[PDB]
Symmetry: C2
Amino acid sequence: DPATCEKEAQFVKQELIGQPYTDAVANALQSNPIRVLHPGDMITMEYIASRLNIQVNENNEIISAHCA
Amino acid sequence: DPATCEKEAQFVKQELIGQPYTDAVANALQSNPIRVLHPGDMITMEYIASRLNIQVNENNEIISAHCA
């Protein structure tokens, strides 16, 4: 659901920056699906408005989120 | 800078969805850098808070935007 994903991306970007992406975090998220993006991942550009992307750095710290 | 990026990504998500990404639209954006994401593009993920991504469909119609 694009509506929930956008809300959740906003929340991640506001409240979770710098924290480890954990099973607690994934379970607190109602978006589906969820994809974790890492530095150097090579992916094909698709567009799933309901998909929450959580961007992390090399140490699994959350740095951003967006829906696609 | 990230401030202008997030503002413009918001303007785009809010006002330009479905519109062709024309030179007139592109030239009006002040973000730097700006990257256009086309369907099926293979992208190596590296997060850059200042970069405005304009995602278009196969007809160059805007479907989304995010900073990364």
